[PDB]
Every structure is written in structure tokens, then in C-alpha cells.
Scaffold this active site. Sequence first.
Site, PDB file in Angstrom:
ATOM      1  N   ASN A  90       0.732  -1.348  -0.088  1.00 26.56           N
ATOM      2  CA  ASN A  90      -0.056   0.008   0.054  1.00 26.56           C
ATOM      3  C   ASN A  90       0.616   1.353   0.007  1.00 26.56           C
ATOM      4  O   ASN A  90       0.208   2.483  -0.132  1.00 26.56           O
ATOM      5  CB  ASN A  90      -1.263  -0.048   0.689  1.00 26.56           C
ATOM      6  N   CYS A 122     -11.605  -5.324  -7.130  1.00 32.75           N
ATOM      7  CA  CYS A 122     -11.821  -6.592  -6.445  1.00 32.75           C
ATOM      8  C   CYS A 122     -13.493  -6.275  -6.021  1.00 32.75           C
ATOM      9  O   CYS A 122     -13.773  -5.211  -5.723  1.00 32.75           O
ATOM     10  CB  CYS A 122     -10.970  -7.050  -5.789  1.00 32.75           C
ATOM     11  N   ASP A 167     -14.827   9.144  -7.623  1.00 29.66           N
ATOM     12  CA  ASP A 167     -15.217  10.502  -7.740  1.00 29.66           C
ATOM     13  C   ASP A 167     -14.549  11.466  -6.874  1.00 29.66           C
ATOM     14  O   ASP A 167     -14.256  12.638  -7.104  1.00 29.66           O
ATOM     15  CB  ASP A 167     -16.502  10.476  -7.021  1.00 29.66           C
ATOM     16  N   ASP A 208      -8.308  -3.660   6.122  1.00 28.19           N
ATOM     17  CA  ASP A 208      -7.483  -4.542   5.680  1.00 28.19           C
ATOM     18  C   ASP A 208      -7.215  -5.535   6.622  1.00 28.19           C
ATOM     19  O   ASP A 208      -6.615  -6.689   6.244  1.00 28.19           O
ATOM     20  CB  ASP A 208      -6.420  -4.009   4.912  1.00 28.19           C
ATOM     21  N   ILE A 261     -16.076   0.372   5.838  1.00 32.71           N
ATOM     22  CA  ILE A 261     -15.347   1.180   4.776  1.00 32.71           C
ATOM     23  C   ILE A 261     -15.925   0.595   3.380  1.00 32.71           C
ATOM     24  O   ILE A 261     -15.922   1.400   2.760  1.00 32.71           O
ATOM     25  CB  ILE A 261     -13.776   0.914   5.120  1.00 32.71           C
TER      26      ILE A 261
HETATM   27  C1  LIG Z   1      -3.827  -0.016  -2.964  1.00 24.64           C
HETATM   28  C2  LIG Z   1      -4.408   0.459  -1.608  1.00 24.64           C
HETATM   29  O1  LIG Z   1      -3.678   1.072  -0.996  1.00 24.64           O
HETATM   30  N1  LIG Z   1      -5.527  -0.074  -1.471  1.00 24.64           N
HETATM   31  C3  LIG Z   1      -6.129   0.336   0.040  1.00 24.64           C
HETATM   32  C4  LIG Z   1      -6.856   1.598  -0.208  1.00 24.64           C
HETATM   33  O2  LIG Z   1      -7.796   1.625  -1.070  1.00 24.64           O
HETATM   34  P1  LIG Z   1      -8.670   2.776  -1.485  1.00 24.64           P
HETATM   35  O3  LIG Z   1      -7.840   3.827  -1.611  1.00 24.64           O
HETATM   36  O4  LIG Z   1      -9.372   2.192  -2.628  1.00 24.64           O
HETATM   37  O5  LIG Z   1      -9.635   3.059  -0.296  1.00 24.64           O
HETATM   38  P2  LIG Z   1     -10.458   4.363  -0.151  1.00 24.64           P
HETATM   39  O6  LIG Z   1     -10.029   4.761   1.251  1.00 24.64           O
HETATM   40  O7  LIG Z   1     -10.272   5.358  -1.207  1.00 24.64           O
HETATM   41  O8  LIG Z   1     -11.892   3.675   0.077  1.00 24.64           O
HETATM   42  C5  LIG Z   1     -12.492   3.929   1.175  1.00 24.64           C
HETATM   43  C6  LIG Z   1     -14.102   3.705   0.984  1.00 24.64           C
HETATM   44  O9  LIG Z   1     -14.280   5.151  -0.026  1.00 24.64           O
HETATM   45  C7  LIG Z   1     -14.902   4.913  -0.981  1.00 24.64           C
HETATM   46  N2  LIG Z   1     -14.382   5.825  -2.018  1.00 24.64           N
HETATM   47  C8  LIG Z   1     -13.058   5.891  -2.673  1.00 24.64           C
HETATM   48  C9  LIG Z   1     -12.736   6.813  -3.344  1.00 24.64           C
HETATM   49  C10 LIG Z   1     -13.451   7.628  -4.245  1.00 24.64           C
HETATM   50  O10 LIG Z   1     -13.264   8.702  -5.209  1.00 24.64           O
HETATM   51  N3  LIG Z   1     -14.689   7.466  -3.831  1.00 24.64           N
HETATM   52  C11 LIG Z   1     -15.333   6.570  -2.985  1.00 24.64           C
HETATM   53  O11 LIG Z   1     -16.585   6.572  -2.674  1.00 24.64           O
HETATM   54  C12 LIG Z   1     -14.569   3.407  -1.568  1.00 24.64           C
HETATM   55  O12 LIG Z   1     -15.152   2.803  -2.745  1.00 24.64           O
HETATM   56  C13 LIG Z   1     -14.843   2.779   0.011  1.00 24.64           C
HETATM   57  O13 LIG Z   1     -16.225   2.780   0.112  1.00 24.64           O
HETATM   58  O14 LIG Z   1      -7.429   1.954   1.387  1.00 24.64           O
HETATM   59  C14 LIG Z   1      -8.404   0.836   1.601  1.00 24.64           C
HETATM   60  C15 LIG Z   1      -9.076   1.390   2.970  1.00 24.64           C
HETATM   61  O15 LIG Z   1      -7.830   1.468   4.086  1.00 24.64           O
HETATM   62  C16 LIG Z   1      -7.591  -0.169   1.794  1.00 24.64           C
HETATM   63  O16 LIG Z   1      -8.698  -1.216   2.118  1.00 24.64           O
HETATM   64  C17 LIG Z   1      -7.026  -0.645   0.635  1.00 24.64           C
HETATM   65  O17 LIG Z   1      -6.286  -2.031   0.555  1.00 24.64           O
END
Ligand SMILES: CC(=O)N[C@H]1[C@@H](OP(=O)(O)OP(=O)(O)OC[C@H]2O[C@@H](n3ccc(=O)[nH]c3=O)[C@H](O)[C@@H]2O)O[C@H](CO)[C@@H](O)[C@@H]1O
Length: 419
Positions: A23, A115, A123, A305, A327
Site C-alpha cells: 500500500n 475487486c 469520484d 484490511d 469502509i
Molecule cells: C492499493 C491500496 O492502498 N489499497 C487500500 C486503499 O484503497 P482505497 O484507496 O481504494 O481506499 P479508499 O480509502 O479510497 O476507500 C474507502 C471507501 O471510500 C470509497 N471511495 C473511495 C474513493 C473515491 O473516489 N470515492 C469513494 O466513494 C470506497 O469505494 C470505499 O467505500 O485503502 C483501503 C482502506 O484502508 C484499503 O482497504 C485498500 O487495501
Amino acid sequence: MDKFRVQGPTRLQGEVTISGAKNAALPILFAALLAEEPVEIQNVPKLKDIDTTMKLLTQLGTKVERXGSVWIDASNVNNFSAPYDLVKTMRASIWALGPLVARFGQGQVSLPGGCAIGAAPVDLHIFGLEKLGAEIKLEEGYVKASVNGRLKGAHIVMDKVSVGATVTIMSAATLAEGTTIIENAAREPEIVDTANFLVALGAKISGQGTDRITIEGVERLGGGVYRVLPDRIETGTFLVAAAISGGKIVCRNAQPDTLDAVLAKLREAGADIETGEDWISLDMHGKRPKAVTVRTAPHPAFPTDMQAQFTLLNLVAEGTGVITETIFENRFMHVPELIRMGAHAEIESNTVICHGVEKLSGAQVMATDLRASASLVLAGCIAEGTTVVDRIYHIDRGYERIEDKLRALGANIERVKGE
Ligand SMILES: CC(=O)N[C@H]1[C@@H](OP(=O)(O)OP(=O)(O)OC[C@H]2O[C@@H](n3ccc(=O)[nH]c3=O)[C@H](O)[C@@H]2O)O[C@H](CO)[C@@H](O)[C@@H]1O
């Protein structure tokens, strides 16, 4: 399709050396797109996701090589498009977007679907980029970004905590004109890691690790050498491995401070834990874990995680445990799998009610995502009999030699072929 054949029960004990954080290596590899000069990223785990990332970088015109370290030369990045074929297996692909437009004035990334643990909307990435002056277009399953001249600093209030968006925004802001504020920024150690990496390149960043990150844009980024922090989830995974098997383990190359919540949770489960500068020891004293209550939330709270792992812990623990996943929306995939193994659990929306059982039974189970996959393998380790975890490619994406590591801990595990 590879599978893990696991023979249990086996107490998991011994030592493990924690790999660099998938990560942090990921966002750093992407951030390296900003680097005009040679970059050396040390302690990069050997994972499929890193391969995918390296390939993607190369596609962009980056010169990439690796061993322990990943050597990056993004001086000649000249291709600003990340095609579906290259991003399809990895949600993190979105990270190419910010650096591309921030440095090149343009970038395009095919949207990966991510996944099954939950949808991958981007967004927030778009939001921050737009705030920075970029024009974002959603077309052709692509996210397109552009900007005339430089990105511009902005006060970006994140209405949601997003690890990924925080990285994109922070990264892109390093090249913007002026100061950027990321309010409600993700605090993850990986953000700190990426921020430190950026600074190593010449970026001006402060507040990383806190809910407020301040970036002072600079005209360009140079190069540098940076060592990725230990993988806290790998660490937690191994800790749980010992915690659910009455085992004892010492995690080497660890960063204790990145696991406050998880360690406290483990303590609640009854674990005997000690920590050093770069190590963490967990000792169950042959004990069964005690059930615990878990509420995932952004760092420094309990990490999603570690959710699947803790579900497993609860499932073989003494008592009723409760796990609330706040999350991701589809992060209980492991539950039915575990129930097939004799686990007792009920799902109520985003909460899984756990009723720990004394022993799991080996079964044919299927890995649906990274953490769950690892969880299933752990379950196989402590279950009675034969467990076959299907689709371990999931684990290959984010775990470095988990097979070897588990074996070194006493696991009876075998990688087999056969769909
Ligand atoms: C490659 C990496 O580092 N992956 C980690 C990263 O993923 P990731 O970056 O995808 O985690 P996010 O923190 O962004 O997502 C958290 C929540 O926000 C939502 N969301 C996110 C972005 C956005 O633009 N809009 C939105 O609605 C997601 O779909 C989810 O419901 O943080 C997660 C939360 O600790 C971990 O579980 C993942 O393993």
C-alpha cells in the site's frame, strides 16, 4: 487456477520478516511518475500488483527495473494513457492519473472495476483533481484529465476519507501552483510514506498522518532514494496467524506504530504482545483467542484490511464477537467460506455477528479478495483436515511469499494447479 492446499491443524509459530507495504510501494511507484530524475524505491515487495504497476509505468514511457528495490527513471514519460489491458486487474491504477496531469498537463486512465470487496468509484480523485484546476472527463470507460499550464493549489475539503483520493490529490498537488490543503485527508501510514517519498523528491508537504495535509507546489520534482515502510496488513496477518493458532510469533522489519488499533485489538483477544523498534511479538501461550468487537474505520482506527483476519479470529475465538465493516460494502465474502468450515456467524448489513467455535473443519473454500484469501489460508492452517483455497492469485497480488512465510511458521501448505 492455482490453489492452496492446506493441511491443518498447525500451530503457527516462529518468525516472519515483514515485506515492504504493498500500500505504500504502490502510491510511491505512481508518484514516481512525477520524478524527473532517477528514483530508487527500496523495500518494495515482490507482488503481482507491483509487476502490474511496473508494466503500466513502462507503458507510460518510464524506465523501470527491480531486483529489493525498484529503480525508476520517469525522465522520458511520453505516453499519457493507461489502457484497460494494463489497469484491469488493479484498482490502484487510478494513481497514474494525478501524476500524469500534474506533470504532463494530461493523463488518461482506463477505469479498473476493482475487486469484489466493493465498487471502485473514483469520484474523490476526480473531485480533488478538479479542485486543482484539472478538467476531468468520464468517457470510454476512461477517466480523462487535462489542465492548461499547471495545476493550481486549492483548499480541498474531503467529504469522505479516502486513502486513494488523498494520494492522488497530494501527489498531484506537489506540482501545482500554490498551496493545497487536503482537509479530512486519509491518515494512513501509507499516506505518510508517500508524502515522505514526495518530499524526498523535492516536494513540500506537511501534515501527513493528520487529517490536514498541506502541500506547497513546486515546479518540478527530482529524484531520490526511499525505503517503503513495512506492510502493516502483512504484519497484522501474521500476528493473527499466531493469535488464532495458540502460537507465538515475532514480526521482523515491522513498524509497531502503524498497528496501535490492531495490537490493542489483539490484546483484547488475549494476546501477549511485545514491541521493539522494528519488531512485534505475539504470544498466545497455547490459548484460544477471546472474541472481540471490531469496528473498521480510517487510520488510526481498526483497518478494514485486517477485517477478514479478525473475522477469522472471532470465528475461532471464545465467545461472541462483532465485526462492523464501515469502509467497504461487500467485504463479508469470507464469511460464507468460513461458515462452510464450521464457523458460526450471522450477517446484519455491515455487521457480522461471530460465535466462535473450538475448531474449524477443512473445506473447499474460495478466495474472493486479498485479505479474505489470506484469511482462508490461515483458517486452513488451523482447521482440522484438508483445506483447499481456490483462486490464490488474489493473494499473489498483495502478499510476498506468504506460502514460504507460513511454511516457516509450521504451516502445511502446498501450491497446486488445476483450475
Ligand atoms: C492499493 C491500496 O492502498 N489499497 C487500500 C486503499 O484503497 P482505497 O484507496 O481504494 O481506499 P479508499 O480509502 O479510497 O476507500 C474507502 C471507501 O471510500 C470509497 N471511495 C473511495 C474513493 C473515491 O473516489 N470515492 C469513494 O466513494 C470506497 O469505494 C470505499 O467505500 O485503502 C483501503 C482502506 O484502508 C484499503 O482497504 C485498500 O487495501
